[PDB]
Amino acid sequence: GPGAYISLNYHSPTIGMHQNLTVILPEDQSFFNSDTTVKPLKTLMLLHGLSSDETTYMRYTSIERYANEHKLAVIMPNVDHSAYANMAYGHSYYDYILEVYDYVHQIFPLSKKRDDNFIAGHSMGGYGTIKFALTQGDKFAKAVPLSAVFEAQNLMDLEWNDFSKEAIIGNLSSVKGTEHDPYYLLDKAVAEDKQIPKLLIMCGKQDFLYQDNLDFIDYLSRINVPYQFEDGPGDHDYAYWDQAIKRAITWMVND
Template sequence: MAVMTLNYNSKTIGMHQNITIILPEDESFFNFKDEAKPLKTLMLLHGLSSDETTYIRYTSIERYANEHQLAIIMPRADHSAYSNMAFGHNYYDYILEVYDYVHQILPLSKDRANNYIAGHSMGGYGTIKFALNEGDKFSKACPLSAVFDINQLLNIEWYDFSRQAIVGEQGDITGTDLDIYHLVDAAVAKRNPIPKLLIMCGKEDFLYDDNKQFINYLGNKGIPYHFESESGQHDYAYWDKAIKKVIEWCTED
């Protein structure tokens, strides 16, 4: 098992960025006469109060990934809501750059069937956004304790978090690319490929009602999904269990 911090000079952000990577070792990595076996890969997006290191520190993700031979790519996206910020960096484009970059330099499968995306809270919001917009890259997507009503995220009071940094002077963002419900409608209208969806949220999570409202909307639009809920708060005790389920679900045949 290789665990690494990859620091590279991002052309999108315009400065060096850190990515945390879990890379399970395959026997082919030591057979230097042949090409390495390409691994299945999960892009994992952090939440508002987290960064690219927190899953390594607060969960057993390394053990889960190794058991299922799944590479995990964990980029850092600040307080961006995984958007191209009005006053800040283009973090939506940056995640796409990370996807392309790691698939270029690491032994990762480029097959859509072997690529997945997941994330919690703000990262869950990012997950569903990429699932609806970039479904040609990911076959499965797993929003965990996700924000689906963007106003709940934009209006949250958190240390050094700014709505204006993301949306500028826009008031109503309904119908914009930040509006997940608008993205659902657009994906259906355009017949975009939508990954298989595993949506999870703890019953004691303050976003539980938001999740229930969203899955009802998916059902009304005829979009398949699997929803799992059990006792759980908005914390890493829940996300440790959730990410184990995500890894099992993504790698099952």
């Protein structure tokens, strides 16, 4: 039924500034009883897309209703225009996510088991999710990119309002074959026999990264990595991602 909506602001030693962070914490009966041990909750790291921040998932979906139904803690950080990268000219936003994961597991009643921790996100956050799935596999059991960018050149060459490509990648004019390419990180993951989280890849059929998503899931089957692809009517809007994260949260908590 109920839960806590928590808004944090702390000085980050990683990115060197105060930063906002919002956390959904569903209510457990352990939390109100002083004589019982706390039961740790499953936790979702939820990554916003470009132009969004730590507030927009709460504002534009009804995710806390979905999270309280399945008693899932949700962590929503803010990474600005970074594409979740340790930026060449800017903040160390790849490392910031591992700091956010470490902090809220130390301070909130969250379970540190691999089988209890998930990660998801949309657009840039979906591209962020597939980066951490392929590079931080022992931290997360399942990963759900929604309408992700899988060929990062489409995100880097995107002409978005005040978006700075050179701030992330520096003087490089291609991201193919580097730590920004999910195809390279996928190749390195199968090469080193690294744990890949359980993949649920969601994208609306009328999205523009739909064909971007079709290329990625086909590449996954050619290298024998299991996934689950759910399509259907949808565009690149919070109307899709509201319904998508509702089915996504139900998918991750039941196994």
